[PDB]
Amino acid sequence: ESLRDLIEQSQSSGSGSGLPLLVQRTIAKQIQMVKQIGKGRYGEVWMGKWRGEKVAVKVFFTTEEASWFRETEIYQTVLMRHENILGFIAADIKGTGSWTQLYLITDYHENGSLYDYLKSTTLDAKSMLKLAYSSVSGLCHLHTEIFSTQGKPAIAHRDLKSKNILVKKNGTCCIADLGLAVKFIPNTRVGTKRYMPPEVLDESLNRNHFQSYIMADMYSFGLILWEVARRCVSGGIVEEYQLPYHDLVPSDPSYEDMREIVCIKKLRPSFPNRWSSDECLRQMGKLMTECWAHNPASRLTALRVKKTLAKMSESQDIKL
Amino acid sequence: SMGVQVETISPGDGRTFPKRGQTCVVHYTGMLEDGKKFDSSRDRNKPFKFMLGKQEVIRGWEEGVAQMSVGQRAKLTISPDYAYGATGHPGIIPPHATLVFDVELLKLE
Numbered sequence A: 001e002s003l004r005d006l007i008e009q010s011q012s013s014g015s016g017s018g019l020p021l022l023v024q025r026t027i028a029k030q031i032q033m034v035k036q037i038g039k040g041r042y043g044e045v046w047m048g049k050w051r052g053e054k055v056a057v058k059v060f061f062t063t064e065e066a067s068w069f070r071e072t073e074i075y076q077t078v079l080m081r082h083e084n085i086l087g088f089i090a091a092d093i094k095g096t097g098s099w100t101q102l103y104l105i106t107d108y109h110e111n112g113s114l115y116d117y118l119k120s121t122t123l124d125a126k127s128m129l130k131l132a133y134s135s136v137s138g139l140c141h142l143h144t145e146i147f148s149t150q151g152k153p154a155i156a157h158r159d160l161k162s163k164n165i166l167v168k169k170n171g172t173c174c175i176a177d178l179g180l181a182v183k184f185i186p187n188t189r190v191g192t193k194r195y196m197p198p199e200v201l202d203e204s205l206n207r208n209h210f211q212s213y214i215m216a217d218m219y220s221f222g223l224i225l226w227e228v229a230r231r232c233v234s235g236g237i238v239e240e241y242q243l244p245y246h247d248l249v250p251s252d253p254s255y256e257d258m259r260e261i262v263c264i265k266k267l268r269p270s271f272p273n274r275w276s277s278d279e280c281l282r283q284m285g286k287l288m289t290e291c292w293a294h295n296p297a298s299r300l301t302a303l304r305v306k307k308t309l310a311k312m313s314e315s316q317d318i319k320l
Numbered sequence B: 001s002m003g004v005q006v007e008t009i010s011p012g013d014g015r016t017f018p019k020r021g022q023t024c025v026v027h028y029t030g031m032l033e034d035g036k037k038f039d040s041s042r043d044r045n046k047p048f049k050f051m052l053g054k055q056e057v058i059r060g061w062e063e064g065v066a067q068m069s070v071g072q073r074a075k076l077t078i079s080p081d082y083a084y085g086a087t088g089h090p091g092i093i094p095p096h097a098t099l100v101f102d103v104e105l106l107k108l109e
């Protein structure tokens, strides 16, 4: 019954991340749905209990079937499984006709997303770097093709935001919400408007190159580094949690709002003054800047960011 | 039903049959019509359990296995209506898939 062990038993055999099919399709009827815990693109996210264990369930209606399909296929990709990607368990279906529900069942993380966790606590350098490094390690894994007999393609996420990264019990992060993800083998303007890079906002993203999606991801990830860094205490001082561009646009900003700030005036989130008094936060500031450059080609790669953060970590005697 | 064809591979005891409410313990291998395998309890060396009449498994399974003897092994050919229908299962079973399960009823509990 031990879910982890069930998943380990079945993935030792091979091919599919998650439970074996026939086991997957026992789950919808047995899960106790407890409460809504958040939101996902095209579906609510609930906590459920299955065999006494908490799991998360992203619930789609049949109008969003294609998205359940796409997202589940991605999660079931070979060599996709990774400590910084949200752990897939099962997909199943319940109910009847117009009320049919499609379930995407995953690990549940009680700390919630980075958005929740940053509102809940302040950080030191070590926790800041652990969240940043783990999160970018997930992104880099997505972005990196892996050759095997059954390979993993390069994947761009396309909806990165602090609400789509979970913080595990051990202080590390895993990436979720893969329903807009693109594999190297789509509408340009999709995702969360507040995190869209200028070229997505104005539809000048070059659709001829997969790389454009990867470079788009790095701008969005730069904004998340800013969110996290604000919460690292230095000199006995710390900022309150805020979303990027909080002072420049309304909540639930529109395309017009974002185009003005990001495409036209080319503004970026501002750095609190106290950052310039701490070498680590100075370095984080430089990393953000280099992630969110207007010109996609000038942005750092996820691998470069990973390596930079690793160097910061070991430069303060911090493990990982 | 032409929806669920049952071809014996190896006979069972011919007397101990699953009743509604009993847990069937089986070993199975599942394949598409072309032969590509998609699940096998034998590959993870752990039998799979389900209760007749709880609708935990596709209807073709309950219908195929219900008519099997403890110890019996049989090829179940199951039409999409008796399995995952037009929807299938993302990345594993395509739409309108006829499936082939090689199933052995090990034990009733």
Ligand SMILES: c1ccc2c(-c3cnn4cc(-c5ccc(N6CCNCC6)cc5)cnc34)ccnc2c1
Pocket: A037, A038, A039, A040, A041, A045, A056, A057, A058, A106, A107, A108, A109, A110, A111, A112, A113, A116, A163, A164, A165, A166, A176, A177
């Ligand atoms: C995007 C994001 C997440 C998911 C998830 C997902 C997996 N785990 N998980 C946990 C939460 C969650 C837990 C606890 C809290 N709080 C803790 C204390 N008080 C404040 C609120 C808040 C939120 C939300 N979503 C998820 C599953 C599937 N697709 C996704 C797509």
